[PDB]
């Protein structure tokens, strides 16, 4: 069989709490759907705050609670990312302003920059930073991501 390979980059401020979860949730969805070979999935940060670090351990526990595998080393977004990805899905409006600012200094911007939450059937538009919160906040990020990723897949390019 054969088909066009699409690519999605999930983005947040530090790439330690939110985006690694979104990436891991999406990655599993496509693997369960038998279409993983058609997708290139990654996640990155708008800042250099946490470069080289594993996901927030609280997010890791949350994921294990749901049996979702998660491995990632934080990295910041690059000028190249705007040319190579079809979709750049971010968590909040601060991420969006930043991405748009960066995208405007790039020669080739192939990516469609959007809020991941714009795909939520329930309209929880923003996926808020759970860093200063606790476990329930991470479970909310997870639930939001499962809802948005499922819906995004139904309409994807």
From Swiss-Prot:
Say which family it is in: Belongs to the low molecular weight phosphotyrosine protein phosphatase family.
The protein's GO terms of the molecular function aspect are: acid phosphatase activity; non-membrane spanning protein tyrosine phosphatase activity; protein tyrosine phosphatase activity; SH3 domain binding
Give all N-acetylalanine modified positions.
1
The scientific name of the source species is: Homo sapiens (Human)
Gene designation: ACP1
Put simply, this protein is called Low molecular weight phosphotyrosine protein phosphatase
Q: Where in the cell is it found?
A: Cytoplasm
Provide the taxonomic classification: Eukaryota, Metazoa, Chordata, Craniata, Vertebrata
Q: Give the active-site positions.
A: 12, 18, 129
Could you tell me which residues carry Phosphotyrosine?
A: 131-132
